Amino acid sequence: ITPPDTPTQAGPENIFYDFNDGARVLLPEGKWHVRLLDADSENILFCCDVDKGWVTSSKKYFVRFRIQVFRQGAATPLLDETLKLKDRPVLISFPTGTLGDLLGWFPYAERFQSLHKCRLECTMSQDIIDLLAPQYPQIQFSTPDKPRTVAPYATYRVGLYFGGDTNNQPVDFRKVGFHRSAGYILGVDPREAPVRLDLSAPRVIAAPYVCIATQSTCQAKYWNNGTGWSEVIAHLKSLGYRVMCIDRDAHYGQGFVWNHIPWGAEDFTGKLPLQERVNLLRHASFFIGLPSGLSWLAWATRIPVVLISGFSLPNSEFYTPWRVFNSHGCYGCWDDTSLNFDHHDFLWCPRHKNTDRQFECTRLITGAQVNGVINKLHRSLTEQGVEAT
Amino acid sequence: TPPDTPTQAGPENIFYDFNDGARVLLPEGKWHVRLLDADSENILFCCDVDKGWVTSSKKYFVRFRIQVFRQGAATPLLDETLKLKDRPVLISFPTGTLGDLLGWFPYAERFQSLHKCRLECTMSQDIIDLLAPQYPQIQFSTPDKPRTVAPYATYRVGLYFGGDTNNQPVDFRKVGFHRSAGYILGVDPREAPVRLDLSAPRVIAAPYVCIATQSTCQAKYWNNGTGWSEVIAHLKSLGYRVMCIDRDAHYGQGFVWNHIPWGAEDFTGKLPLQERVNLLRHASFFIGLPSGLSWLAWATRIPVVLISGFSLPNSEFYTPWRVFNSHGCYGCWDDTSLNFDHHDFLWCPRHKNTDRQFECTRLITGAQVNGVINKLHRSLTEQGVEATL
Amino acid sequence: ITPPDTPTQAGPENIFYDFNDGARVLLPEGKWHVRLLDADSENILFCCDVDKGWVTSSKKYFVRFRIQVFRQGAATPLLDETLKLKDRPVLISFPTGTLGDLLGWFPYAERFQSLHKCRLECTMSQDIIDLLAPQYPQIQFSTPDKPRTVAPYATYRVGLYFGGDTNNQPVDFRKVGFHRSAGYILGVDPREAPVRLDLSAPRVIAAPYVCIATQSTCQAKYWNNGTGWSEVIAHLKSLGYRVMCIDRDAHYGQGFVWNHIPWGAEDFTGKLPLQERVNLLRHASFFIGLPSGLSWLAWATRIPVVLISGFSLPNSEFYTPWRVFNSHGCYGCWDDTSLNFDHHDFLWCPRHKNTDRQFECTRLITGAQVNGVINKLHRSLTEQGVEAT
Ligand SMILES: [Fe+3]
Ligand SMILES: [Fe+3]
Ligand SMILES: [Fe+3]
């Protein structure tokens, strides 16, 4: 996933400059004074004297950089080029991060291209490509190992950067929301939007039904209330809905802590292509889930989404009137800039790990609370149209 | 200031309330009290009190359920659940600045439409004159002359510092100072402009732009030496007349004073806000700071160029013309590890009394602002007023 | 700044002596006894036995020195030379200091020449040369880098010496006044006088007008009263005067502290030749300024000068009945021998930096105070003239 070993642009004096991984310039032997500017503000971002080697901007997100190379003590610069992306090869590289990450990030990539009118290629796992590519003919999708461009003018690496990093992102993603961070990185309208999907599939299950997602990547994201899911599933049926579980896994966990597809839900679990999930989701009356990926997919299918989460604040994901949250105990571990997410600890709870208050984030969210929300949504579905937002 | 005695009204002598945030007062002799959240059915607080006031630690909106038990009895004496329909409710704002109130107010209207209550709001006369005509369903008064006298519930909308989570559900710095009001009242947290009287006819014939350069602390000022002057000169070169509409022409502390910029026309002074609304309405656009006039300008439906470095772009209302620089210190105001000082006009927690003081806004050059002005100007001439907003 | 590397006058046995940088004698290879005397008092200033190398007076200001060199055992001296400046090449070197410095010092250089009847060359920036040279045909003007007399008999470097230095100046300039110090250095009548200017230019602006200078070299010299300038400018107009600001810069400052041409003053700013400023000043009814340079120029064009200053005492600059000063708080940072001016700190206030009281020097000088003195000046002008003394 590395940038070219040598910058892709030819400077007048055997000098190569690049905007892959930020503004780069490789100097041949000589005497130089190099300047990086922000073209929009005219500010001098960085400035130094060197003989040969590398000069790279500390900022890696989108900046309209302007590179200037001077012979020490000269009046005009030998090289003076400003980033201009129109009709030029650009690479946006996503990591093979979770599903929710990409569905959140991706629209911002399309915005970047409409704005700059560049030749854009994006890199991600094949399964997302199969899901999205047809709806974005403007953009070329590839895999990290076989990108078509080979030599690009500019590259941007959209992802999450922890520990408050402000070199790869303009603002800490925790301040703006993990998905909106993509917009800031790329310098586009940061307002959230759903991906475009193939919503042409015809209805298969005739009766009214609801989809649910109970599994996630860490325990904190689970709804850790003892009887929550069982109370919800029972209630959904008492309203006349069939209930299907569409989690990738039927059992998931670590050590002795294991989570299983709830008794009473239908087994639509399994790892299959996302398009099949889209097709099933499309005709669901609504969806109940966690802040992991499937909720973003449900969102993009244009159906109501009941989102249950205590470890993140309501503004941490896309807006839904059906968001569930409880503010009486610990909440928002995830958005707190004084704490640090541990990728390796599935049982991560910064403030209460190994105490009887562990995962209070979600234990305070009762089935009654979730059913209350479901009742309002149900009334709105009967009494008002589906169209009623 | 809640009533000295709860305004209910419970069948036995003791009176219960929701004015501070609930409240029960019990005559001498033992009882056991239970506070619940009707939505989740969780027991929030539980105790035995022989005498005195028992009140919830949470003061923001919750569907409280008060239960009073005789010791060791199985059934409760009192079991009242908050129901606001057709009842006197008081929303008390502080006499804070303009921007605060304009930002918060729409949430109070939402609270009313949701609960169908009899709502009275308390605020400075100044704002009442501006808003009252457009919110006929709500009663407006001043803090010293409230008409309700006896209210069923009271809610105190404001900013609470130091990470307080008793008067607000979530630290306002995590959600935005204005959106906090929606969380306190428990309604749709999405920002909206207030409704104004936009009937006034055009007075100044030629195209013009309004600007606001003053603010409440030095950090909210545009501390770039030549910023304003470069902008004002540029505006004129595009054919715009420029008017300054700040309440004061000179404002500051100690030796630090800010003045209406040379070259701007003098429309300053403490006028009724409606006159500012009338002038603003026909301005091609507005340039200001995260202070109050920007919120007024917003609500008059004209494009707003908003310059701010101490505040992240997300925090105020959205505008595609937000100016922000991410290369140095930024966001003093949103940072939960720091603390705003009301008494220090020269507040800069990270760089006070150093070379970098107010870097927040010194990095924002006139060129940067003129770049944004140029795009907005282009969009106004190319497209219409429709197509921008 | 540099004196010849070898003294310009030849003594008998290969000794070179001169007075360029104090009294100097370069001795080659012998056992010598050297005495420096003050011919006026006959005092032996310095006395020593030296084998080879340099012997210079510690005193560098004007002294009628008498150099005597002895063989170690000798009854009488082989060098008996005593300073005599008649018809001899003398160099007076000014630093490239501010305008007020030079205009204050210069008259004393002319006095030194009238007194001693020598051939005098002066070194200073070109812009001052253009202003003065025509009125001082007796004196030869040059710039520091291109001096015409490469072998001078005596040299004197007029300037400010800090830290109570008494080797380059007879007495601390803070005790006698920065401008008068020049006369002490040169040993002439120390009484202040204005420079001779070309006052022949004809009137251009017909109506009555006042010139003002609001900018300066450090913040302490600004009139840091919040509403001062604005109140003065408004008042001048109500008296029928047009007001022009003639500062070199329209904006000046450092960090976040910036000063701008006051709203309401006509813009006559910019880096123009001083002769254009003299021509404009000449016909002004009067001038209002700070202890910086333009006030000295105003003075010399023979118009009444209102001088506002708190960081220096009234006697610190030239006499004017229109000097404005406030004695109730901190004043006179500048004249205080126990403090030290900081050339590198634009926000220097030794007593009160970084406190509420910073620049109390001039916050105590209100617009009312200045308008009071303007009123008196105005009455005297309408009634008596011009001639006003
Ligand atoms: Fe937690
Ligand atoms: Fe700051
Ligand atoms: Fe002082």
Author numbering:
A (entry chain I), C (entry chain K): 10 to 398
B (entry chain G): 11 to 399
The publication says:
A subfamily of autotransporters, including AIDA-I (adhesin involved in diffuse adherence) from diffusely adhering E. coli (DAEC) 2787 and TibA from enterotoxigenic E. coli (ETEC) H10407, are glycosylated in their passenger domains, which functions in bacterial autoaggregation and adhesion to host cells. TibC catalyzes TibA/AIDA-I heptosylation and confers AIDA-I-mediated bacterial adhesion to host cells. Here we determine the crystal structures of TibC heptosyltransferase, both alone and in complex with ADP-D-glycero-β-D-manno-heptose (ADP-D,D-heptose). All the 12 TibC protomers adopt an identical structure containing an N-terminal β-barrel domain, a core catalytic domain, a β-hairpin thumb, and an iron-finger motif which are arranged into a palm-like shape.
A number of point mutations designed to reduce the surface entropy were screened and a TibC variant with three mutated epitopes (E83A/E84A, K400A/K401A, and Q215A/E216A) produced the highest quality crystal. This mutant exhibited identical biochemical and biological functions to wild-type TibC. Strikingly, one asymmetric unit in the solved structure contains 12 TibC molecules, which are assembled into a large ring structure. The overall shape of the dodecamer ring resembles a circular garland with an external diameter of 145 Å and a height of 72 Å. The inner surface of the stem is decorated with uniformly distributed 12 ferric ions, forming a characteristic iron belt along the ring. Six symmetric TibC protomers project upwards from the central plate while the other six project downwards, generating a gear-like shape at both sides. Two adjacent TibC protomers projecting oppositely contact each other in a back-to-back manner around a dyad axis; six back-to-back dimers are further linked together in a hand-in-hand fashion around a sixfold axis to form the garland-like ring. The β-hairpin thumb mediates the hand-in-hand contact between adjacent dimers. Within the module, a ferric ion is tetrahedrally coordinated by four conserved cysteine residues (Cys-339, 342, 358, and 370 in TibC), analogous to the zinc-finger motif. Thus, the iron finger is required for maintaining structural integrity of the TibC dodecamer.
